[PDB]
DNA sequence: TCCGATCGGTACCGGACATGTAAAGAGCAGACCACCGACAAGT
């Protein structure tokens, strides 16, 4: 719906500030809860 | 300004030597670009240092 | 790593923009690590192997359609099992309508997911066909897939 | 950037009927409400959040908390 | 054709002045200097 389009526009925003861009970049990936760390 | 540029360049050298992922290296290169731009003309792009 | 000169980029007019026929926003995105730019493309190699790549893309689309059909038939057999269970013991009509609309919503979700996958494949193929130098690929996942 | 005030009014919890019954004596308000090309509360709130803080993925509660922090806290 | 952003500029002589925070600690090693023992050859 419109929510997906808004999310895509937000992710495609220029984000001229360097710190904001870095936060957006690091926010793309997920976390490891309990066991994936051992496997890695 | 010269100290900031030299520090960021040395950190980029260390990151390349270690083998850091692409995100960290790209962030460091962007910081180096911003430091050089601020050195040559402070205030043209972004906020002044 | 090379660093561009601020005088010749952030100016009115932008000399780099005029030289390279690039908009100032495009230059800002490129030189500040925000979007990829295609330096060059091998047109001859792409044209020679275009038919094989299109055939492989068609095979991939056929495979994803077959997977969607398998998911649809799994949903259909689950619905048939639910109907058999409802025939085994009596139940009210409200719960039957609820499970019917839940199954309809699930199959519509699967259909729109398949449609989104097909649209993504079509967009990737169109981007590859229309690939040319001095073009910005602002989507990181699209460039990774390419 | 400029935003129509009807979007802000809807984002505060008011509906179209509330706006009509509250600002029915004015022509500019009605013209803005007809020309907003935006309906509902969640859509207006998401638009306000996008305008205020571009690049941040919005959700149901982040925009409301941001507005409360900005004004009513 | 219209218009939201961005960049350029805005008198002179005299004078005046100097930063305000720290989440630590330990183990091991390297370079340099003030105090020293021997031992044979030149003085």
From Swiss-Prot, chain C:
DNA-dependent RNA polymerase catalyzes the transcription of DNA into RNA using the four ribonucleoside triphosphates as substrates. The RNAP catalytic core consists of 2 alpha, 1 beta, 1 beta' and 1 omega subunit. When a sigma factor is associated with the core the holoenzyme is formed, which can initiate transcription. This is DNA-directed RNA polymerase subunit beta'. The chain holds residues 99 to 244 of 1317 of the full protein. Belongs to the RNA polymerase beta' chain family. It comes from the Bacteria. It comes from Mycolicibacterium smegmatis (strain ATCC 700084 / mc(2)155). The lineage of its organism: Bacteria, Bacillati, Actinomycetota, Actinomycetes, Mycobacteriales.
From Swiss-Prot, chain D:
DNA-dependent RNA polymerase catalyzes the transcription of DNA into RNA using the four ribonucleoside triphosphates as substrates. This subunit often mutates to generate rifampicin (Rif) resistance. Interaction with RbpA partially restores Rif-inhibited transcription; once the subunit is Rif-resistant however RbpA no longer stimulates transcription. The RNAP catalytic core consists of 2 alpha, 1 beta, 1 beta' and 1 omega subunit. When a sigma factor is associated with the core the holoenzyme is formed, which can initiate transcription. Interacts with RbpA, which partially restores Rif-inhibited transcription. This is DNA-directed RNA polymerase subunit beta. Belongs to the RNA polymerase beta chain family. The chain holds residues 221 to 293 of 1169 of the full protein. Mutations in the RRDR sequence (residues 423-449) confer rifampicin (Rif) resistance. Rif blocks transcription initiation but not elongation.
């Amino acid at each position: 719906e419109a929510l997906r389009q808004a999310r895509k526009d937000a992710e495609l925003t220029a984000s001229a500030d360097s710190v904001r861009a870095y936060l957006k970049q690091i926010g793309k990936v997920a976390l490891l809860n309990a066991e994936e760390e051992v496997e890695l | 300004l010269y100290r900031r540029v030299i520090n960021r360049n040395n950190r980029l050298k260390r990151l390349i030597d270690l083998g850091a992922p692409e995100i960290i290296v790209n962030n460091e290169k962007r910081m180096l670009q911003e430091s050089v731009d601020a050195l040559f003309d402070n205030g043209r792009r972004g906020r002044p240092v | 790593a090379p660093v561009t000169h601020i005088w010749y980029f952030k100016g009115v007019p932008s000399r780099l923009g005029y030289l390279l026929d690039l908009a100032p926003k495009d230059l800002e995105k490129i030189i500040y690590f925000a979007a990829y730019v295609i330096t060059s493309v091998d047109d001859e190699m792409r044209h020679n192997e275009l038919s094989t790549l299109e055939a492989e893309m068609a095979v991939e689309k056929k495979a994803v359609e077959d997977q969607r059909d398998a998911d649809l038939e799994a949903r259909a057999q689950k619905l048939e099992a639910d109907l058999a269970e409802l025939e085994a013991e009596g139940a009210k009509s409200d719960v039957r309508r609820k499970v019917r609309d839940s199954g309809e919503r699930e199959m519509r979700q699967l259909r729109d997911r398949a449609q989104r996958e097909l649209d993504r494949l079509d967009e990737i193929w169109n981007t590859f066909t229309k690939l040319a130098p001095k073009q910005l690929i602002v989507d990181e996942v699209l460039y990774r897939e390419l | 950037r400029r935003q129509p005030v009807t979007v802000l009014l809807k984002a505060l919890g008011w509906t179209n009927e509330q706006i009509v019954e509250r600002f029915g004596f004015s022509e500019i308000m009605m013209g803005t409400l007809e020309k907003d090309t935006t309906s509902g509360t969640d859509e207006a709130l998401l638009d306000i959040y996008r305008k205020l803080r571009p690049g941040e993925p919005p959700t149901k509660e982040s925009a409301q908390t941001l507005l409360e922090n900005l004004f009513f806290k």
